[PDB]
Amino acid sequence: KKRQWALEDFEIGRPLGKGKFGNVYLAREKQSKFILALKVLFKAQLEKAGVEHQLRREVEIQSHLRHPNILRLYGYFHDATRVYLILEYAPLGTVYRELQKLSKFDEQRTATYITELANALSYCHSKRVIHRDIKPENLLLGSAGELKIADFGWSVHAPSSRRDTLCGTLDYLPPEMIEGRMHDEKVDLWSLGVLCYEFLVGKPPFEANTYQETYKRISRVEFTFPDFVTEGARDLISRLLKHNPSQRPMLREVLEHPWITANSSK
Ligand SMILES: O=C(O)c1ccc(Nc2nccc(Nc3ccccc3C(F)(F)F)n2)cc1
């Protein structure tokens, strides 16, 4: 990607999503009539967080990833007030909204999303990229209904030492992360297990009223299953949520899991 863009090249449309830093907009590039999404971040907002460098890492990382299950970053640009990220547009919205709607998914839709996810995380990890923010408000759906990892804000290079006052919120964070320790690609395997549970049950398995209690649930790995969660599903999830990262499966074993294979349409 070569030429420099600017706001004047784009017609901005419907707001897709909101945020403190800024909003995501449907937009159309005037010359090609190309439909995409523009994420607009205020320079004056993001300096306060010291995240300007993590934004630069998010941009560097996401633009260099090519995967059907990862949301493209085409490029970026800035001006006086704000910063613009030029994104692939995922027409069906977030997995979060799907989940609010259906209230929870079935084993076939779940195992398929888990498959699209695992495939994507394989790609990333081969590049030694850890996501660490994996969660349904960060996951989008393409035209065909396929899962796409969207928001790379917290992704990092592996391994990582990071204690970040926010690496993005507790329900999806593994014990080694919340406890401020060293971590690796095993982080996303835990998160995959949290997500798998949220898909079937409709709520993350560590959910609680306060951060302090959720913190307790995570570090103690305290979760229970509703009667309707099948043993195959229980088994994969129990395999993924392990306090000891090294006892978590490789994505290969995830993709090869009996319940995944019996269920995934992909
Ligand atoms: O109508 C909708 O609700 C709708 C329709 C299409 C969408 N598709 C879409 N495409 C690219 C980026 C993007 N950002 C975004 C927006 C809102 C929330 C989360 C994100 C994420 F995931 F990128 F961070 N959303 C998003 C939302």
9 is in an annotated binding site: no
Residue partners of 151: CB distance under 8 A and separation at least 6: 71, 133, 137, 138
Segments of the chain assigned to CATH 3.30.200.20: 5-93
To test ligand 1's pocket by mutation, which of 23, 24, 87 has the most ligand atoms within 8 angstroms of CB? Answer: 24
Method of determination?
Answer: X-ray
| Residue 139 near residue 192, CB atoms below 8 Å | no
Segments of the chain assigned to CATH 1.10.510.10: 94-266
Q: Say if domain 94-266 classifies as CATH 2.40.420.20.
A: no
Between CA 224 and CA 233, with CA 230 as vertex, the angle to 5 degrees is 75
Between CA 202 and CA 122, with CA 187 as vertex, the angle to 5 degrees is 90
Whole-number Cα distances in Å, 89 to 13, 18, 37? 12, 15, 5
To test ligand 1's pocket by mutation, which of 12, 14, 16 has the most ligand atoms within 8 angstroms of CB? Answer: 16
What phi and psi values does residue 64 have, to the nearest 5 degrees? -95, 0
Q: Say if domain 5-93 classifies as CATH 3.30.200.20.
A: yes
Q: Please give the structure tokens belonging to residue 153.
A: 């804000």
118: left (phi over 0), alpha (psi -120 to 50) or beta: alpha
Cis peptide before 204 (omega within 30 of 0): no
End-to-end CA distance of the chain: 32
Whole-number Cα distances in Å, 152 to 30, 67, 130? 27, 14, 10
> Which amino acid residue places its CA nearest to atom 7 of ligand 1?
93
